[PDB]
Design a protein around this ligand. Structure first.
Ligand SMILES: Cc1cncc(NC(=O)C(=O)N2CCCC[C@@H]2c2cccn2C)c1
Ligand SMILES: CSC[C@H]1O[C@@H](n2cnc3c(N)ncnc32)[C@H](O)[C@@H]1O
Ligand SMILES: [Cl-]
Lengths: 310, 625
């Protein structure tokens, strides 16, 4: 194993993100036992994960990682339990992973981060109910917003606009943001107050639409323009923790849940694929940039499964 | 100084973390007993069968540390009042698991959130847990002074924060607590950890919380402003609350990260300890009664019973009261023997209930100050105290004082008296039977004689104390009415309680009473205008008395004789608490009743709802003649 890379990888795999070049990012937390912490792992070999010996780089974080995202090619942005958003810069040779900044700005676990379309800025969500907008260059918080009445479940940056992102909370609100308005937030979503939202994915092309999964295992396709819930389906038996759109020009929706099942859906939310291969919770997915019909999932069962999606 | 603890929702190594916060200056630590993000399934496979361990080992700390240093927190994914059946059931099991583990470790306290309106299933599970095995770990309900919804930034364009007056709307947070505690039948093991935000509410909302069992106050790092030099401090409003919470001896909990980054955490804490050591130090009274706060005691009956030596010791260890008695006699002597008569006129002055003779001494200090001549009788029935009078008398007083060893109602006096002087008042004036005792003795007062005191008046005021209501409830005894404890007064230094209205007078007695047909029974209807929302738990009793002319004793808080610590207030409880809404009038009715043998109080609330009549026929409580 590489220098300054931990001997043992923590049991609970939270994050799984492919870079443009086909390398696999893994975040993992220790959610039980003496020491409650986490770690970052770069795998230039995606088939050699989770194994700690045949990895390119790895590092120990002070605390567990709740969410993870690439900043471009060399940058790794981390939502810590510590109340910190930490930015880990990758090495020249890409052999070690070094802390660039680590800022304790939230007052409770940081549960979600998302990088804005520019790539110079990110918005974080925490259990302290605050949402914050970061300057990654300057390493400081630009904006701090208490829009919500409950812990923030999910924040998702718009693909193409640096001032727009969705957020959702246990206060039952889905909030469409726009930092240009003097009241930045705007409460959209279905007619009657329904079941709590748990996950958000923008459509990668129709910049006006997105999907949200609820705690009842129901994925919903929504228009902000039409601002009226066109479509939905009962995909999962339990909470929907993640929605991930494929890189195809007409894309597929991967749906990962606490019922330990992965689903893949067409644009009308009918079922194309499903996998039981995970026997604990399914925590993330990223599609292969190299093979557009390959999909990678990680669980709390320390499994890294790779799927052939028809 | 303060007892304070640190709240963390992240602990990587329980060993090192606890080391840091001890080092910072904290007394204890609030931390999760399972990892906050470690959601667990109990019914549906496969997640159900997740390989353990479920959390970290109990061996990581000493039993001593667990018992003293650690407060558990419920994992924030546990939502027993979810509208989703599957989440209800997991949260039901997960809550029992976390509570049962807290019990396994012997944690002294365990935090639970009150952060929505409906906590019916939460109360059910906790009430069920409280009644499973036995432990005596405390449950701190985390409640915000201001709901998170009424504290949000006004930045949702289509959903604005209504800028209207809502008197009850901004109290909802107390109703959350009230309903939860009521569901749990006022369990003594359920208290409030009161969470304070950057914008304090209106005083009346902070006034709901006055009589409630606050074991902790939570201060987020947010609410702290920054002084010139760079340290953290608090607004003048936040400071008033702290000074109030310090007199209630709550524990302070600091939560959230360090936002004053050019300092250690022990700055946030140093500021509390600065605030603590910088309060008006305890006055003579607060120092005296420092261990008696909300401690129930049976009211003394110095007629029916013989008071113990050490009881008379405390009556006597009260100079301010005896100064007033001295002055009152001094003034009475001068208004009775003119200067020309000063060496022709010996006044005959009788102490009625002399104890060990603090009044006999005041009566002597009186006459050797007004330069007039007095003959002293000292009538005392408690033969144990009469031993003390006769030793004093033989050793110092001489023939000036005759000690009489009998009941003033039975005693046949050789001569009639100018001035009778008595100290027969209870915390409710007439509740030690000063009336009946002085009535039976007035026949040996001259047809122009003075009684000191000449007048006393009892005062009532309705109170809210979910704390004291519980201390009474906790007085149930085998082999008597299970509700007897509610139908009797308690002497108590009322401390953690809310006065719902100004005291009004109840019963008044004059001495001598020249009325041809003397009746010491009474009926008194009282109407208490209440200008707050609250719950009635009982009535505080006080008294004032006129010794002579403008010389007075009072325990009425308004007119309270300063530095006088011979009486605590009396408390008349009510079986069932009564909701009182802002604007409603509380109407209470008190009767003084009597036999040949007994004297007692019956009482009833008639508005805004009626109570049961308390202590009918003195069945639960009487005062022996
Ligand atoms: C002159 C006189 C006549 N009657 C009663 C009192 N006082 C009290 O009845 C009274 O309030 N007591 C005493 C019995 C213990 C409780 C409480 C007390 C504990 C310490 C100080 N005090 C005040 C004084
Ligand atoms: C609280 S001080 C009251 C004192 O008055 C005394 N006392 C009360 N009632 C009578 C009575 N009827 N006759 C004589 N002494 C009394 C009591 O024994 C006590 O010492
Ligand atoms: Cl008692």
């Amino acid at each position: 194993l590489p220098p300054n890379a931990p001997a043992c990888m923590e049991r609970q795999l939270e994050a799984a993100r492919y870079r443009s070049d086909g390398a696999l990012l893994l975040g993992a937390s220790s959610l039980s036992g003496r020491c409650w912490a986490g770690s970052l792992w770069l795998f230039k070999d995606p088939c050699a994960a989770p194994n700690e010996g045949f990895c390119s780089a790895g590092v120990q974080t002070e605390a567990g990682v709740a969410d993870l995202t690439w900043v471009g090619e060399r940058g790794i942005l981390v939502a810590s339990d510590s109340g910190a958003v930490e930015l880990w810069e990758l090495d020249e040779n890409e052999t070690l992973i070094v802390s660039k900044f680590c800022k304790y700005e939230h007052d409770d676990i940081v549960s979600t981060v998302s990088v804005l379309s520019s790539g110079t800025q990110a918005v974080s969500g925490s259990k302290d109910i605050c949402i914050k907008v970061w300057d990654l260059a300057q390493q400081v918080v630009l904006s701090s917003y208490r829009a919500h009445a409950a812990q923030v479940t999910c924040v998702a940056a718009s693909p193409h606009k640096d001032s727009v992102f969705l957020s959702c909370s246990e206060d039952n609100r889905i909030l469409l943001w726009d930092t240009r308005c003097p009241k930045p937030a705007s409460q959209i979503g279905c007619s009657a107050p329904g079941y709590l939202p748990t996950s958000l994915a923008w459509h990668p092309q129709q910049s006006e639409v997105f999907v949200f999964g609820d705690e009842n295992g129901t994925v919903s396709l929504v228009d902000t323009k039409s601002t009226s819930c066109v479509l939905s389906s009962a995909v999962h038996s339990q909470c929907v923790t993640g929605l991930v759109f494929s890189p195809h020009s007409v894309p597929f929706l991967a749906s990962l849940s606490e019922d330990c099942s992965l689903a893949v859906l067409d644009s009308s939310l009918s079922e194309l694929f499903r996998s039981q291969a995970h026997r604990d919770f399914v925590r993330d997915a990223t599609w292969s940039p190299l093979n557009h019909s390959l999909l990678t999932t990680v669980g709390w069962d320390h499994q890294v499964v790779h799927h052939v999606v028809p | 100084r303060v007892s304070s603890g640190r709240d963390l929702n992240c602990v990587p190594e329980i060993a090192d973390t606890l080391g840091a916060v001890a080092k910072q200056g904290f007394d204890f630590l609030c931390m999760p007993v399972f990892h906050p993000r470690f959601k667990r399934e109990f019914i549906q496979e496969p997640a159900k069968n997740r390989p353990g361990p479920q959390t970290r080992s109990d061996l990581l700390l000493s039993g001593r540390d667990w018992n003293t240093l650690i407060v558990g927190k419920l994992s924030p994914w546990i939502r027993p009042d979810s509208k989703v059946e599957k989440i209800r059931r997991n949260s039901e099991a997960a809550m029992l698991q976390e509570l049962n583990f807290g019990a396994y470790l012997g944690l002294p306290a365990f935090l639970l959130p009150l952060n929505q309106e409906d906590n019916t299933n939460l109360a059910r599970v906790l009430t069920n847990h409280i009644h499973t095995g036995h432990h005596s770990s405390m449950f701190w309900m985390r409640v915000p002074l201001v709901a998170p919804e009424d504290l949000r930034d006004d930045i949702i364009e289509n959903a604005p924060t209504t800028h209207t007056e809502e008197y009850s709307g901004e109290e909802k947070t107390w109703m959350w607590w009230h309903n939860f505690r009521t569901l749990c039948d006022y369990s003594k093991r359920i208290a409030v950890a009161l969470e304070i935000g950057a914008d304090l509410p209106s005083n009346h909302v902070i006034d709901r919380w006055l009589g409630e069992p606050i074991k902790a106050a939570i201060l987020p790092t947010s609410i702290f402003l920054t002084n010139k030099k760079g340290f953290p401090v608090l607004s003048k409003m936040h400071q008033r609350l702290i000074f109030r919470l310090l007199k209630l001896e709550v524990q302070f909990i600091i939560t959230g990260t360090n936002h004053h980054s050019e300092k250690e955490f022990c700055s946030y804490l140093q500021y509390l300890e600065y605030l603590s050591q910088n309060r008006p130090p305890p006055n003579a009274y607060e120092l005296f009664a420092k261990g008696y706060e909300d401690y129930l005691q049976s009211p003394l009956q110095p007629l029916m019973d013989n008071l113990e030596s050490q009881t008379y010791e405390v009556f006597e260890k009260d100079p301010i009261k005896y100064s007033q008695y001295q002055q009152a006699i001094y003034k009475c002597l001068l208004d009775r023997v003119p200067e020309e008569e000063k060496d022709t006129n010996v006044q005959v002055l009788m102490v009625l209930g002399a104890g060990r003779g603090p009044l006999v001494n005041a009566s002597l200090r009186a006459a050797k100050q007004a330069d007039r001549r007095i003959k002293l009788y000292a009538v005392e029935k408690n033969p144990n105290a009469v031993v003390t009078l006769e030793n004093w008398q033989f050793e110092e007083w001489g023939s000036q004082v005759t000690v009489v060893s009998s009941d003033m109602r039975e005693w046949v006096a050789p001569e009639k008296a100018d001035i009778i002087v008595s100290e027969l008042l209870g915390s409710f004036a007439d509740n030690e039977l000063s009336p009946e005792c002085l009535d039976g003795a007035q026949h040996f007062l001259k047809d122009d004689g003075v009684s000191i005191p000449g007048e006393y008046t009892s005062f009532l005021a309705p109170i809210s104390s979910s704390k004291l209501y519980n201390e009474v409830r906790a007085c149930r005894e085998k082999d008597r009415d299970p509700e007897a404890q509610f139908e009797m007064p308690y002497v108590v230094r009322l401390h953690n309680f809310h006065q719902l209205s100004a005291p009004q007078p109840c019963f008044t007695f004059s001495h001598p009473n020249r009325d041809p047909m003397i009746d010491n029974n009474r009926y008194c209807t009282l109407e208490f205008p209440v200008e707050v929302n609250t719950v009635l738990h009982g009535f505080a009793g006080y008294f004032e008395t006129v010794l002579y002319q403008d010389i007075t004793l009072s325990i009425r808080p308004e007119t309270h004789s300063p530095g006088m610590f011979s009486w605590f207030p009396i408390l008349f409880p009510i079986k069932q608490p009564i909701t009182v809404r802002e604007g409603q009038t509380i109407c209470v009715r008190f009767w003084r009743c009597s036999n040949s043998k007994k004297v007692w109080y019956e009482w009833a609330v008639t508005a805004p709802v009626c109570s049961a009549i308390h202590n009918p026929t003195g069945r639960s409580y009487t005062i022996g003649l």
